[model samples]
Target chain A: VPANAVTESDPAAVALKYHRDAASSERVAAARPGLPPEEQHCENCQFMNPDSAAADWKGCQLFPGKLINLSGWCASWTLRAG
Target chain B: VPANAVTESDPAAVALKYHRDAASSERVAAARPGLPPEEQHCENCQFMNPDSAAADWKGCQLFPGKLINLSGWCASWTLRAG
Candidate 1:
């Protein structure tokens, strides 16, 4: 929840084992533009709590107190409603 | 390297933080398939100790007591010599 949380200081929250795992990033459907419709990502996901209007990183509601890449995805992600 | 060593029982050795990272797989030269002469991967890397001449998984000398995917690559990967 705190705005300062990040991968280095709060690895346990965002690292999520797979988060830090190198291959975990590719698991996101968007990583492959070839995938149709692409999957959800933190930047546009409803569960995100961005500290700014436009930032490459944001805090995830699902795992508070940690920063996540805007392009990052997890099973809990859901598209932000327009 | 022990044959029983695997990700399930020895994730620490192979999970290697970034190892589990989804994007890590694609970072390898082989993942692109079309990339010219992959940088390195466990299958052909000299550091690997493949249980069989042809197996999907093998053991690594750098991080012992664990099995890794043949396609897996790490910073320590090296070319095997005759």
Candidate 2:
């Protein structure tokens, strides 16, 4: 695993792994239908900001270089209000 | 909402409303001794069975009456092995 690469041991890691695995299976893509636009989403979350380099084509605020779909929900999701 | 009651708009009804609001702030009871004894846990998990009858006294096979504290993990945990 890369330094922050995530694995199956931790629940958050498992969640990320699920996302990556889902993406690879083409179950997820650049833009899923029900999600908010990245810029208007829960700001401050690593998965919500679009300006960060980590927010790539799919609009995730984390691992921007990867194509994680923004609509994806995970176990570690902490709601970022306003 | 006691018709099989649970609420807060559903995330498994907010994880059974955070396990009934953490068992009314008692922080979960009937068993807080660190791990299982109630007859081989993870066995078709309603929360791990010791008998059934919803598996009460913290061995929750589901909603076994009350006092749920079987090493309480939530988020719809579903790890029922063998």
Candidate 3:
């Protein structure tokens, strides 16, 4: 991951309510309300590159040219391989 | 308006896809797509405090203790008194 990776303020990020810390976002409460809060995270998201989990900053399919933080999350997040 | 007023980066702001400039937001295209692009603005939004139009940062019904830019917009935007 580059030093200048995408931030929560990015327009595309904001559109999807991307948060560096998923648990702290109000949007998280509003997204997939039926699921446990712990289940909603970038680490389990389909759009996140599985290989990059060990890294602090990981690649996400939705965000081209930028990596998302492991603790980050967005509304577009879906269950990985399930 | 106070210097510490709300910004597009605020969590509540991000939850609603708030943009300082409506036309620049990708979320705007995804909101009320049936209406003309020109018709979607804070000036016409029901959530915007109608009396604050003259100010650069106007009061918003949905955002308490924070003001929104006149040119701003969000997914929560609704037609005023219509």
Candidate 4:
């Protein structure tokens, strides 16, 4: 899982606010201004590679060759299309 | 500007939804769901190399060796901080 998942410390992740767990992200956000806790998540985000949706962690349009947690959230989250 | 600015057709740009002009992206997004037309722009994004913000085009954390337009937007856009 560690190998497949992007680390929170990753330069891209730090800049983008990528978190492995939405709930933890929300907690972090509470300490500072951050994304509103809602339906926003990686799986529902358009940047997520549709081909890897079956995996708990999947590839993202932004961070190539790495996987983001399906339960994660980032500043770039866009609503997925049907 | 052309020399420094990233091409719309750049493979990384395509996946990240990068656009030279946020306004143009809105038009493109009209045909499909996209980023909200608000304050989200590259210069203000965290992934941007702060050192080059003074330039019209600047470096990005994801796409090294290339520059992104200050007015552009990408799926990985993150709010900037001091």
List clash counts for every candidate, in order: 15, 6, 0, 0
- Each prediction's fraction of true contacts recovered: 0.00, 0.00, 0.00, 0.55
How well does candidate 4 match the true structure in TM-score terms?
0.64
Q: How accurate is candidate 4 locally (lDDT)?
A: 0.71
Q: Which of candidates 1 and 3 is the stronger one according to DockQ?
A: 3
Candidate 1 whole-model C-alpha lDDT, 0 to 1: 0.48
Residues A9-41 of candidate 4: C-alpha lDDT, one tens digit per residue: 987787667788877675344332223456678
Q: Judge candidate 2 at residue B30 and give its lDDT.
A: 29
Inter-residue clash pairs, candidate 4: none
Please identify model 3 stretches exceeding 4 Å from their true place. Answer: A52-54, B1-82
lDDT of each residue in A29-81, candidate 3, tens digit only: 66554356677788777667656434678877556547788787777666676
Q: Can you write out model 1's per-residue Cα lDDT over B10-53, one digit (the tens) per residue? A: 42333232142224643544343322335455666665777633
Cα lDDT tens digits for candidate 1, A3-78: 5534533423332322422335545443423222344456566657766334666666534345666766654344
Q: Where does candidate 3 clash, by residue pair?
A: none
Which digits, one per residue and each the tens of the lDDT, describe model 3 over residues B11-69?
A: 55665677888887665466554366667778777667656534677777556546778
Candidate 4's C-alpha runs over 4 A off are A2-4, A27-38, B1-5, B21-24, B27-41, B44-46, B52-57, B62-65, B71-82
Q: Which stretches of model 2 miss by more than 4 angstroms? A: A8-21, A25-53, A57-82, B1-69
What is the model-wide C-alpha lDDT for candidate 2? 0.36
- Per-prediction DockQ comes to 0.02, 0.05, 0.04, 0.44
Off by over 4 Å in 1: A1-82, B1-39, B52-54
Q: For model 4, how does the per-residue alpha-carbon lDDT over B1-82 read when each residue is reduced to its tens digit?
A: 6565678987668877678988767534433223344767886776788575345877888765578888888765656756
lDDT score of residue A11 within candidate 1: 27
Candidate with the greatest DockQ versus the true structure: 4
